[PDB]
């Protein structure tokens, strides 16, 4: 019972690439902005759940385990996707192709402006580290498996180890030396520390808007929310 372990580095890359979710669209006061973001985030969750299944090793897990990993890391994956979409738009966040926002634009919702800065700082970090899409979809999957594995789990760490092999392989092909290979590996995985912190700072803001009831939130986005309490 392996399935995902028998793959090569190339087959791992193509699997994650072909499974990548699409870039959705959207149709500024506090309620106006927070309403669009809520609408957009609700539609992105649905596609992510399909992306989760088409990740090697994920379908091998039980239903409860899949639910666990997604409930803990849904906001991170939403952010790292948002971060990478706006990677070549410095000082701007690309929530949608027809929805690009700036720092001062986010201040229309207080508490959200802080999350903007971290989101921008991460995309700037990716832009400055010259993150690749192949490297990205790996980080995307690492978060899915790692962010909650502590909360035969042995299999997940086997898959995590194999995803790591992909990055090393991805960097080896790029002509990076042995030293630069594990150095870039460290830099990429340390962003996931930041990305995690963003989610927690982001998960806190959403709960505020829930209790504020200013923005009617999707009940799907609710069951994903109160799973952190």
């Amino acid at each position: 019972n392996s399935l995902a372990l028998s793959l090569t580095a190339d087959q791992m890359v193509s699997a994650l690439l072909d499974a990548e979710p699409p870039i959705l669209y959207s149709e500024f006061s506090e309620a106006s902005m927070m309403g669009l973001l809520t609408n957009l985030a609700d539609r992105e969750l649905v596609h992510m759940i399909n992306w989760a299944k088409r990740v090697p090793g994920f379908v091998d897990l039980t239903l409860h385990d899949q639910v666990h990993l997604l409930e803990c890391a849904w906001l991170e994956i939403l952010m790292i996707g948002l971060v990478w979409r706006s990677m070549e738009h410095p000082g701007k966040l690309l929530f949608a192709p027809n929805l690009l926002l700036d720092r001062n634009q986010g201040k229309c919702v207080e508490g959200m402006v802080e999350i903007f800065d971290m989101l921008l700082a991460t995309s700037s970090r990716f832009r400055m580290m010259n993150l690749q899409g192949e490297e990205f979809v790996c980080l995307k999957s690492i978060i899915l498996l790692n962010s909650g594995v502590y909360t035969e789990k042995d299999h997940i760490h086997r898959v995590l180890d194999k995803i790591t092999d992909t990055l090393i392989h991805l960097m080896a092909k790029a002509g990076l030396t042995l030293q630069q290979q594990h150095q870039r590996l460290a830099q990429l995985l340390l962003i996931l520390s930041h990305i995690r912190h963003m989610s927690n700072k982001g998960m806190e803001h959403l709960y505020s808007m829930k209790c504020k009831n200013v923005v009617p939130l999707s009940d799907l986005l609710l069951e994903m929310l109160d799973a952190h309490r």
């Binding site: 759940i49 989760a52 997604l70 069951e223």
Partner: peptide
């Protein structure tokens, strides 16, 4: 319940 269960099955 959880809507997440439904989507992971469909």
């Amino acid at each position: 319940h959880k809507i997440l269960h439904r989507l992971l099955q469909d």
